[PDB]
Amino acid sequence: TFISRFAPDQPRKGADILVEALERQGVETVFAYPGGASMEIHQALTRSSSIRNVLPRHEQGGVFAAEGYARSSGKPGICIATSGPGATNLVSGLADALLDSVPLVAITGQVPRRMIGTDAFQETPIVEVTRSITKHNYLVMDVEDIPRIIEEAFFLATSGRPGPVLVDVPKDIQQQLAIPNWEQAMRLPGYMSRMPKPPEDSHLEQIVRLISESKKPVLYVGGGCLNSSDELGRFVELTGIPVASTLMGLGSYPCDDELSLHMLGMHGTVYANYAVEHSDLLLAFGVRFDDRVTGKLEAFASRAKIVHIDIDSAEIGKNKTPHVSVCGDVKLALQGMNKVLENRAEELKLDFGVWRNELNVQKQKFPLSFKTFGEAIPPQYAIKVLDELTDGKAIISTGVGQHQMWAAQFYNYKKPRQWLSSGGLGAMGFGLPAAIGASVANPDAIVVDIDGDGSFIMNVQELATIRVENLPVKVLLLNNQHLGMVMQWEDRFYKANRAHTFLGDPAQEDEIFPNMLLFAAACGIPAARVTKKADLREAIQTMLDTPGPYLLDVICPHQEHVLPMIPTGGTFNDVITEGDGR
Amino acid sequence: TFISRFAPDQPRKGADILVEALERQGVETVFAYPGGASMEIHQALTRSSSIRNVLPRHEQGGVFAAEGYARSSGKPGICIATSGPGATNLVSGLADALLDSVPLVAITGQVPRRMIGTDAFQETPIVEVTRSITKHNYLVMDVEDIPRIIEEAFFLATSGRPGPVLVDVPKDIQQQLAIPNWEQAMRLPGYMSRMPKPPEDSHLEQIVRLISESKKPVLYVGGGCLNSSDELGRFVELTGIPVASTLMGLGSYPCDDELSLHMLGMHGTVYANYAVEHSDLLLAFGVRFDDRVTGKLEAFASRAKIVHIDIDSAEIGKNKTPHVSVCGDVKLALQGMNKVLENRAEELKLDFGVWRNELNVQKQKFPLSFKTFGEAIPPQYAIKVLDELTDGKAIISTGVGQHQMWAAQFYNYKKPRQWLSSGGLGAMGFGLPAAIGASVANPDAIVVDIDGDGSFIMNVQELATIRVENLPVKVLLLNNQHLGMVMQWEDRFYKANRAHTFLGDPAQEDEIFPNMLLFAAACGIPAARVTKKADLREAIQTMLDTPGPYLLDVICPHQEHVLPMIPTGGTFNDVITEGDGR
Amino acid sequence: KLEAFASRAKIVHIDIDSAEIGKNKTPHVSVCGDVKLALQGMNKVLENRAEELKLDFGVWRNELNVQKQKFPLSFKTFGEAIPPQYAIKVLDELTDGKAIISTGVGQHQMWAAQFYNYKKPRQWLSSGGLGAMGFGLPAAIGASVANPDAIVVDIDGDGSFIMNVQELATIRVENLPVKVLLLNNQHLGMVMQWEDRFYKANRAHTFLGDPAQEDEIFPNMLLFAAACGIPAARVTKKADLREAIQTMLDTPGPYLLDVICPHQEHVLPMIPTGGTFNDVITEGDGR
């Protein structure tokens, strides 16, 4: 039974209805930045004793913090901004949440309804702007529509395929007095009629029948299995099928397990891409067949019967036509198949040891490799030390670039929602704010931001947010003085012609620029720099043991390349296995 | 005669056609951030010996730098970004350039044409997103359309009412070989037919006739007069009409002149708002009648015959119907009226000394005032010292907030394009990157960023850009540890209830947080902090005399309020003249 | 009701539009491509592996042949009044089923689909997705131009025919052998049928005649054809129906045959909107 701060017959401001609408949704943390259009909302937030606001230093850091809050907990992330410039700073976060299917609810202030369309002070048509980069958006035109729209916003953002939902609230609606009606029915008739239903037994028995008829099955797990870690693990025990995860599906099946093929795709392991290339049954659970995994669609799984399970009917058959399809929750599809695989266990006699040994041979001949040059710190080795010292139980958020791939390859994630990274949009500056949202949603957890010197500096202002909110956010900065991912593509396909990829100072060429330690010192965050490989283990241990925030500037040779690499539009026969920029 | 780097019959990449198309437009400086979708453009930029790229540390800093480059020189500002997250970071700059009518050309990379709409890697419909926040945008669908679209983009961005134009270029178009045709005719038939024509003599003679019949005339000058400083000054000599400028029109008529009423509007001087309130002829030259100037439209210039000259026919009569209107360039309208005012000089016998003395009395009784508390530095006084030590010849870029208003009130700008500020959108984090673009376009000029502690930290990463490019950018940081503008509205209309406006550390409440000096030290920029009013003059002098970049952390008491203040929707009778937060 | 449609069947969906596969119902096996090529590929497998598969569904066909004989398409004849179903059945016989049929929208559209045996595709031109009235007469114009040596017949309704009646001038000027089998029931029959079933026969602007002269055929469609110089005739008795349709076919050039039908007829069978197979209506009309 919800206990309101107002009487059921007492009129209250629309902003007070908005905050209470969040309280009735279970919202405990918002990321709001104040402004003229949203001052009424911020005043109403102070009256709430259950909703905590984490003030960022940039609205892009506020929406990215809402993503990490959502990616690391399954709950929806709520960010609030003002009209005009405050709303336009959320654009990168909204498009990022849409491509990665992150439940998010963004509330933006707006000019009064009478001033909309008049080029008013700090007015931008944020609904027209964000319609193509959000799952759905609203423009509240009456104070009585607030309880319904907020309920519809959280329902659309969390149900089906999750995504961001923006709610634009004009200022005159926030100030208008009204008595809210919390019993209104949602006006989503076509959406609810198209919601997926529990999977039929005829579809599940046909999948189990294809498993027994197959000799080389491979599991294709992605971001749709973040809530099916137990169901997927039970499915692997009953089948013994090796698991290949996407960049979004890391942690769904433990990377340290013997049946794990780790990541597949452009920068996936050689044995994971080998398994899909020479498979006869591809179980695509919670994936969307991105070109980062398939490359050339004509050659991707060219000899496999494709079984695609997805909660979005628009994804089934988009880039590749499957043989058997199941539109619904992969969590329920696994539960239904586990019952069939257990009763009919001895009837099926499932054993793929011959196919697994074919992959174990490929795993031992082409494993993830990194070369150590003298005392220079290998970035792959540094992340491998972080795995050991944290026992693989740390929540990892990353930026975008070479460090993002090495953090995915050389860290064994035991559970999903430990791996927070921008995969669909690939937005730099995501690592640091996402670690803020993850640390708030998981206070007793080890949160480490494996960031790059280019991605870290984009939202470096959020270091002040970490200090003020006293969050134990660790920053494992892999500094290579370059935009490493773009630098790698210059060495491979452009004759190493540098085109504005060096991030240091050309005057003092051999000086670490910028001095990231002074960035942490400016915000009162203890920091240290490590350059020699021998001092690396003690430095990372000091970062973890030191209470509160900590930044570790790890210097790495910039000539390193992420391996292996399948060029864009290439096949498995075009995989690059060796080479760098020396 | 343009000299190309390729033979007229030699095929070249589409990216090389794009860069040469910029060279043929006179482009010398671009602000490009590399990415997978725009690597071909960056490779082609290195082959250009005339186009210099200023690499920012954030695309929002790149587009804001393109604004300051344009606002301080009249030339169009060119910023380049990659697809997906790089393009979405330009959104705040595009909407800011549209509301302030800043000529800007944004070039964004895009996924290959075959992959558009497939939720590809780093794909966002940037044309669908930015259609409502740009003057016009394009999606290049063929390599042969590059010479025409670039010519149309620069024409639309600089002609008529200036604005931002976005050009989305897919990657396959950048790589395709072709022979460019630089003789293509622009396909803008309806736009050129609607372009304003030179003003007719019948309209100009009717304006001059209303000037002689009026007794209390007031000039209403705005951002449309940035290229008419000489024509406007000549017009004032022949009429003796006092000049009231908007936040965008500062510098058009010198603030130090005796005939200048300084700024009008919400935070405009009392005597400027008094002149418009009690006028019989309002000469609105290059303005758009924003609610920040009018307030309540029914009471704004309620006794004046309104003469509105504007180059956009959609602005004439939008918020207020004028008596006489002239659709065209205010530069030509002033030239035509100056000829009539000089030949018919003794015939008209123009003299408004009685009306000017009525305003001089109001100027002496209600001037711009600030109170000095002990040795605490008044933010108004610090800007007044910067005016004296720079002789008013410095290019000033500001953020948004209280410091933005004090930099407009207490600095006498002698020429337009010395004042770079976000007025229409009012985007924080604009001051520092705009100073970068202004310093590049004006290397031998004094560029000072009067920023606030909240606005400065949003794009603090651009300090690395200032050091690498070795730009003599001065940062006069008015630090009040608060979001001062929002804090002021809390004291006035919300009983001083703080709602997430304090930017410091609540644990160490009386400690300056963050330590902005260490931000400059991280990027190798000399910095210093001044707290006592006596040491203020020597500190600002050290900032100016020290070559290269410099940051001056000026500590100010946060209880200061921007005065005077006309509340939203109020009239001249509701102006607040005294009060603060003590 | 999608939940009950083919509730016990493995659905195999072949379609050239990937957006249609799995939209309203999820199939077990899907093939995105041209069904023409999919049939060619399956025919080769079915012929080589013919004796290996031993395909025989005579037991399932006999189960349907029993249902076909107990519930066939039925129409009732009332005295000498012309049954609209019978008139279309006569047109099938006199044209040997080789005529190109274009229809409007309504009851006449359904009877032209039920009681005519089309031997080849592209003989049946009708608005199904949008269901636009006034489609029959102009579509017969385009079909007669694309197929000059073919028998083109417009099975139109009095409401649909009048919407684009101006195209009769186009038929005469272009000299097109367009036959108009007008099933005149003086009503918007399809909307009238739904009034009798679900609205207690409360007429809501469905009568197309003249209420002053209630028992007079209004409008006189014969004078519409006469205005455009098209020979026309009206038939009311069932005995004169066979000779009237034969005169329409044998007369060269355009021809309009005003076939008067009792308006109380209903299109059967009928499954109500959102219903299942257990809700099929098999008998009943408006008498």
Ligand SMILES: Cc1cc2nc3c(=O)[nH]c(=O)nc-3n(C[C@H](O)[C@H](O)[C@H](O)COP(=O)(O)OP(=O)(O)OC[C@H]3O[C@@H](n4cnc5c(N)ncnc54)[C@H](O)[C@@H]3O)c2cc1C
């Ligand atoms: C620099 C860089 C390099 C990259 N390289 C790689 C790479 O080498 N390999 C790689 O895999 N990725 C890589 N990516 C990431 C990438 O572009 C995509 O995010 C990824 O390839 C696709 O993730 P996904 O298949 O799991 O689909 P997601 O984006 O995770 O979407 C989930 C899918 O499952 C479905 N779904 C969601 N919820 C449910 C549910 N409850 N039940 C059933 N279905 C559900 C959704 O409809 C959707 O189709 C890279 C990214 C970057 C920035």
Ligand SMILES: Cc1cc2nc3c(=O)[nH]c(=O)nc-3n(C[C@H](O)[C@H](O)[C@H](O)COP(=O)(O)OP(=O)(O)OC[C@H]3O[C@@H](n4cnc5c(N)ncnc54)[C@H](O)[C@@H]3O)c2cc1C
């Ligand atoms: C915190 C804050 C407080 C503010 N308070 C104030 C305030 O107290 N006072 C104030 O004035 N502003 C204030 N503003 C700024 C503000 O919101 C608007 O930018 C400003 O009020 C309107 O500027 P403008 O009238 O010059 O029109 P602009 O935005 O400068 O547009 C120029 C106008 O002239 C026309 N034009 C352009 N070129 C030509 C040409 N060549 N010939 C003829 N016409 C042309 C255009 O069509 C357009 O209508 C504030 C902003 C902020 C962020």
Ligand SMILES: Cc1ncc(C[n+]2c([C@@](C)(O)OO)sc(CCOP(=O)(O)OP(=O)(O)O)c2C)c(N)n1
């Ligand atoms: C907002 C934004 N702007 C530009 C981007 C285009 N990209 C990249 C990519 C993969 O998206 O290329 O398509 S990666 C990259 C450079 C990474 O700098 P680092 O942080 O130092 O990481 P590292 O460990 O050194 O490699 C750029 C510039 C991007 N994604 N986001």
Ligand SMILES: Cc1ncc(C[n+]2c([C@@](C)(O)OO)sc(CCOP(=O)(O)OP(=O)(O)O)c2C)c(N)n1
């Ligand atoms: C991207 C962005 N986000 C939020 C904004 C909403 N606003 C403001 C306003 C006027 O737009 O209110 O409508 S001003 C302001 C706070 C100014 O912090 P400061 O830099 O310290 O300046 P000061 O000298 O102390 O006053 C905010 C939060 C904004 N405009 N831009």
Ligand SMILES: Cc1ncc(C[n+]2c([C@@](C)(O)OO)sc(CCOP(=O)(O)OP(=O)(O)O)c2C)c(N)n1
């Ligand atoms: C342009 C147009 N306007 C109105 C229509 C709505 N409908 C119908 C329907 C099925 O679409 O109802 O949804 S059928 C119909 C009446 C048919 O008049 P008839 O020609 O005399 O045929 P009959 O042999 O008597 O039954 C109407 C009014 C329509 N489809 N098209």
Ligand SMILES: COc1cc(OC)nc(NC(=O)NS(=O)(=O)N(C)S(C)(=O)=O)n1
């Ligand atoms: C807190 O700082 C400021 C500053 C400022 O101008 C200096 N004005 C305001 N307030 C309004 O503008 N109210 S309003 O007129 O209803 N708007 C158009 S809105 C919805 O807020 O964009 N707050």
Ligand SMILES: COc1cc(OC)nc(NC(=O)NS(=O)(=O)N(C)S(C)(=O)=O)n1
């Ligand atoms: C430079 O860093 C990277 C990284 C990376 O993935 C790790 N891929 C690429 N290149 C492409 O993606 N080419 S592409 O396939 O034509 N694109 C979809 S696009 C237009 O570039 O977005 N560059």
Ligand SMILES: [Mg+2]
């Ligand atoms: Mg930033």
Ligand SMILES: [Mg+2]
């Ligand atoms: Mg780097």
Ligand SMILES: [Mg+2]
């Ligand atoms: Mg401040």
Ligand SMILES: [Mg+2]
């Ligand atoms: Mg489909």
Ligand SMILES: [Mg+2]
């Ligand atoms: Mg009818």
